[PDB]
Design a protein around this ligand. Structure first.
Ligand SMILES: Cc1cc2nc3c(=O)[nH]c(=O)nc-3n(C[C@H](O)[C@H](O)[C@H](O)COP(=O)(O)OP(=O)(O)OC[C@H]3O[C@@H](n4cnc5c(N)ncnc54)[C@H](O)[C@@H]3O)c2cc1C
Ligand SMILES: Cc1cc2nc3c(=O)[nH]c(=O)nc-3n(C[C@H](O)[C@H](O)[C@H](O)COP(=O)(O)OP(=O)(O)OC[C@H]3O[C@@H](n4cnc5c(N)ncnc54)[C@H](O)[C@@H]3O)c2cc1C
Ligand SMILES: COc1cc(OC)nc(Oc2cccc(Oc3nc(OC)cc(OC)n3)c2C(=O)O)n1
Ligand SMILES: COc1cc(OC)nc(Oc2cccc(Oc3nc(OC)cc(OC)n3)c2C(=O)O)n1
Ligand SMILES: Cc1ncc(Cn2c(C)c(CCOP(=O)(O)OP(=O)(O)O)sc2=O)c(N)n1
Ligand SMILES: Cc1ncc(Cn2c(C)c(CCOP(=O)(O)OP(=O)(O)O)sc2=O)c(N)n1
Ligand SMILES: [Mg+2]
Ligand SMILES: [Mg+2]
Lengths: 582, 582
């Protein structure tokens, strides 16, 4: 029983209809940056008592914060921008949310209807630009269509395979008066008809059948699981199959468990890629078979019968052709297969201890390793220390680079929606704003940002947003004075020829630049820098215990390399296990 | 006689062909941020001895710096980005360069040809996204086409009406070996055939004819003039017609001259809009009749015969229908009309002293005015002081907002290419990177950035670029703790209801936030803050005399309003001449 602030017979502005339409969808947090074409919307947001606005300092920071809000909770993220330059600053966020299937609803202002197509002031064809980087977009041509389009936007963004949905609203529609009809039926015939049905017992019983016939099975878990945390763990108890995870599926199965193969792929563990290489049954749940995971598709699980479950029928059979396939929710497939395994438990007699022992051998021979040089701080050890002091209960958001991979390898995530990282697009500067959105969605959680000196400075303006909104965002900056991921490839494949990968000052080459502590000091945030490995544990303990935001600059030797590394398009036999830039 | 670093029979990489193709076009400065899909290009840039790379800290700062490089010199600006998130950060810059007709050539990396359309790693359909915000774009499908596409890109970007041209290059093309053929003929049949011809004497002699028949003529000068600085001044000597300028045409005719009406339009002077309102002949040279200038098109020059000269045949007759029109270069039209006026000088007997005196009356009755409150610093006076101490010889780049309009009103630009401001798109954060590009193109010039606290913080990361590259960029920050332009409209049309327009900290409301001095201190840039009007002259003198970069924080009362102001879509009779938020 929703309670409106307006009478059922009282005409109100279109912008007031839009805000009420958001309140009916359960929205309580938006990330809106004001502008000329959206002042009516901002005026209507102040009249709302149930919607809080987090004002960012850059629209790209607003859409990245909406992603973190969605990645860390499951709700859709809502950001609002003005026309022209406000809308074009959302492009990096929209393309990222599509590639990583993040529920997102972006609302942008627009010049009045009678001015579109005239090269007007702050006018850009935002619908034609974003048509290829959104799940769907709309252009509101009448104030009557507002209640229906908003309903379709939150539906398309959260149902099926989630994604971003943009809604462009002209200024004259925000000012027009009307009486909204909240009983509108959605105009999505072809989308709802193609929606996946619950899985058939005919398909599910052949999956359980293929498991008992298999000797070396591996679970290939990805970003589609997330909501299926419990169902997946229950499925592993009954089968005892090792679990390999993608960058997006971290936390779906706890990393501290003994059955965990951790991450597989290009920078995946040797034992996880080994299990896939010498498997006969591959259970690919919620994955899309990225080239970061497979490399050469002909050598990826070459001797394995492949089972693929995905809610998007377009993804099944795109790169790798499976034997058995199931189009639907992985959460329902696991529930249906758990029932088959409990009833016919003694009939199956499932035991893979020989396959697990063969992997435990490789898990002991080729584990994740890092080197300590004197008193310098190895970045991997800094994350292990953060893992200890937070007990693995912290929400981690990262940038893109070496620090990103190390944040995945050397932290054991226990639950999903704990790991926020741009994996598909790989957008730098994603970290700090994503931590802002997660801290708003999870106020009582430990939100720690693991950025690099290059990624951190891109959206460094959002430190003002952190202080103004008083968020307990912890920034664990791994400063290596370089663009690490690009520098690592220069050492291997370009004879260490530096090509604009140094971020410091060449005049004072042995001086840390910039002085990131003064960046936090400008925004009134307490900061500290640690350089010696002995002082590391006390420095991170200070960051966590200090109430409110905190910045910790951790200086690292730039010669470190992320390992292991299967080169681009290579096979498991081409894996690199040792090497650095010294 | 170009000298290559390779033999005519020596195969080289496609990336090396691309760099040599740039050297043949006269490129000597690029703004490239490295990434995975463009490392081959960065490797080839180090091998070049004639091309300098300015590494930014954000790709949006790189494209905005390429605009300032082009706006302040006339050369085309060249920025280079990686695929995926690197390319999508150029969108705000591409849309801006198109709306303001800035010659721009953007090169982006891309996943190899065999991976486009597979949702690959860091893969975005950059050609389909930017098709509507660029003059043209390309997708290189063969290493053979590189010498031709680069030639067509620099041709399309600089000829006719300038604009941005994007070139997407897959990674496998950068690595492929080939022998370039530099004798390729461009494949632009339809574009070159539609190119404008030199103006006919039949058209030009009717223009001179309409001038002698007119009693109240006004010159409507815009961004198309720029290159025609001398020809325009010579044309005014012979006719004696007052010159009104757009935001983009500032400097085309010197603002310190007595015949100058300064800027017209929404925030234009009362006397400039008056001359247009009561004119009988309007000479519109290099303008596009924006709604920021005209408002209601039926009342704009309602009693005037309109002469329009533009190099784009699509712009003539778009909004306002002219009597006489000339499609071609305004520089050639002025040269042809100057010859007509010198020969038939005594035959015409041109004198408009009665019309000029009628305007000099309005110029004295309604001049640009500002109020001084106690010892507070009025922002308009700060720009007047900067105008004095630099003798109007400084290259000025601004953000978007109140400080932008005041930088246009209270500074008398003497030559074109001195005023760098996003007018068409109106993108915030454009200022500081644009000052970087101008300082690289004009090393011995006085480059001063007039930013607002909101616009400055968006691309504040570029201060590291200023220090590392050791550029003498002066930052005149007009901090009013608010988003001024949005706050001004709240006071007039929304009863001063603040809707997320305050940038400071609500906990410490009377504390300047953020402390912008520490932002410069982090990047090792000398900074200072001035608050009292008496200390203002000494503070700006310190900024200019200090070698290298300098930041000056100028605190202003936020209640100031930009005046005059013709409201949106209004006429000259609706002009607002007084008012503020007190
Ligand atoms: C520098 C860098 C290095 C990287 N290295 C690696 C690496 O080594 N290993 C690695 O794995 N990744 C790596 N990545 C990330 C990589 O690009 C992809 O993000 C990742 O490989 C793909 O994740 P995914 O398979 O879980 O698919 P996702 O992008 O997470 O998509 C989820 C899939 O499940 C489906 N799905 C969604 N919801 C449901 C549901 N409710 N029910 C059923 N199905 C659903 C979706 O349709 C989709 O097909 C790296 C990224 C970067 C920037
Ligand atoms: C907050 C804000 C307030 C603003 N207020 C105002 C205002 O009050 N007044 C105002 O004028 N603007 C204002 N603007 C800017 C405005 O949006 C436009 O930028 C401006 O009005 C249009 O400039 P222009 O007429 O010179 O056309 P331009 O954008 O500069 O285009 C140049 C025209 O000349 C043509 N041309 C180009 N080269 C040549 C050549 N070589 N020969 C012949 N023709 C050529 C082009 O085809 C084009 O038609 C404001 C912007 C902002 C952000
Ligand atoms: C942020 O500060 C500013 C500045 C400014 O011009 C200086 N304008 C706006 O609002 C718009 C934003 C975008 C387009 C606009 O054009 C417009 N909007 C209308 O709304 C009804 C009507 C209109 O008629 C010409 N033009 C307008 C406009 O308000 O003019 N905001
Ligand atoms: C599968 O075959 C190939 C071949 C190829 O070039 C011939 N490229 C790609 O994908 C990329 C797409 C974009 C950037 C790329 O380089 C790259 N890849 C990374 O993966 C971790 C990281 C990185 O650091 C910036 N650069 C790569 C890359 O695989 O080299 N795949
Ligand atoms: C916006 C953007 N630009 C460029 C890249 C390419 N890129 C770049 C430039 C990387 C180096 C990141 O440097 P960092 O300091 O932030 O992190 P590390 O040095 O620890 O790897 S990683 C990577 O994929 C990108 N992913 N996103
Ligand atoms: C990227 C972006 N976002 C929003 C806007 C809308 N906008 C905004 C938010 C303005 C206020 C600018 O604040 P400022 O501090 O930088 O300058 P002043 O307060 O002196 O006007 S002006 C304007 O057109 C914009 N033009 N560009
Ligand atoms: Mg780094
Ligand atoms: Mg301001």
């Amino acid at each position: 029983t929703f309670i409106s602030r307006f009478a059922p017979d009282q005409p109100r502005k279109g912008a007031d209809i839009l805000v009420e339409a958001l309140e009916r969808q359960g929205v309580e947090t938006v990330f809106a940056y004001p502008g000329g074409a959206s002042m009516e919307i901002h005026q209507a947001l102040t009249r709302s008592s149930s919607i809080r606005n987090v004002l960012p300092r850059h629209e790209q920071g607003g859409v990245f914060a909406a992603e973190g809000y969605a990645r860390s909770s499951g709700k859709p993220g809502i950001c609002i921008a003005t026309s022209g330059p406000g809308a074009t600053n959302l492009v990096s966020g929209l393309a990222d949310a599509l590639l990583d299937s993040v529920p997102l609803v972006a609302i942008t202002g627009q010049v009045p209807r009678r001015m579109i197509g005239t090269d007007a002031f702050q006018e850009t064809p935002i619908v034609e630009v974003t048509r290829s980087i959104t799940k769907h977009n709309y252009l509101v041509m009448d104030v009557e269509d507002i209640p229906r389009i908003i309903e379709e936007a939150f539906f398309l963004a959260t149902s099926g395979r989630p994604g971003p949905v943009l809604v462009d609203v002209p200024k004259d529609i925000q000012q027009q008066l009307a009486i909204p009809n909240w009983e509108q039926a959605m105009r999505l015939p072809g989308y709802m008809s193609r929606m996946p049905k619950p899985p058939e017992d005919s398909h599910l019983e052949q999956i359980v059948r293929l498991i008992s016939e298999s000797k070396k099975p591996v679970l290939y878990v990805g970003g589609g699981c997330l909501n299926s945390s419990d169902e997946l763990g229950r499925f592993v108890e009954l089968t005892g199959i090792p679990v390999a995870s993608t960058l997006m599926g971290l936390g779906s199965y706890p990393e501290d468990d003994e059955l965990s193969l951790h991450m597989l792929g290009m920078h995946g563990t040797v034992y996880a890629n080994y299990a896939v290489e010498h498997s006969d049954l591959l259970l690919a749940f919620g994955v899309r078979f990225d080239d970061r995971v497979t490399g050469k598709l002909e050598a990826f699980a070459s001797r394995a019968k492949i089972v693929h479950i995905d809610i998007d029928s377009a993804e099944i059979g795109k790169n790798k052709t499976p034997h058995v396939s199931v189009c639907g929710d992985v959460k329902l497939a696991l529930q249906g297969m758990n029932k088959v395994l409990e009833n016919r438990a003694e009939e199956l007699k499932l035991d893979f201890g020989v396959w697990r022992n063969e992997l435990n051998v490789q898990k002991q021979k080729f584990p994740l390793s890092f080197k300590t040089f004197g008193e310098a701080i190895p970045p991997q050890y800094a994350i292990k220390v953060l893992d200890e002091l937070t007990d693995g209960k912290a929400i981690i958001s990262t940038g893109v680079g070496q620090h990103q991979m190390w944040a995945a390898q050397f932290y054991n995530y226990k639950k999903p929606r704990q790991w926020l990282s741009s994996g598909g697009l790989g957008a730098m500067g994603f970290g700090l704003p994503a931590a802002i959105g997660a801290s708003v969605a999870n106020p009582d959680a430990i939100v720690v940002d693991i950025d690099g000196d290059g990624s951190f400075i891109m959206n460094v303006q959002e430190l003002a947003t952190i202080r103004v909104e008083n968020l307990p965002v912890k920034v664990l900056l791994l400063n290596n004075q370089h663009l690490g991921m690009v520098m690592q490839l220069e050492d291997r494949f370009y004879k260490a020829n530096r090509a604009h990968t140094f971020l410091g000052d060449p005049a004072q080459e042995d001086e840390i630049f910039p002085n990131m502590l003064l960046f936090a000091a400008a925004c009134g945030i307490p900061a500290a820098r640690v350089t010696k490995k002995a002082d590391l544990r006390e420095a991170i303990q200070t960051m966590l215990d200090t109430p409110g935001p905190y910045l910790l600059d951790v200086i690292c030797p730039h010669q470190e390399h992320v390992l292991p590394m299967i080169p681009s398009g290579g096979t498991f036999n081409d894996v690199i296990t040792e090497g650095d830039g010294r």
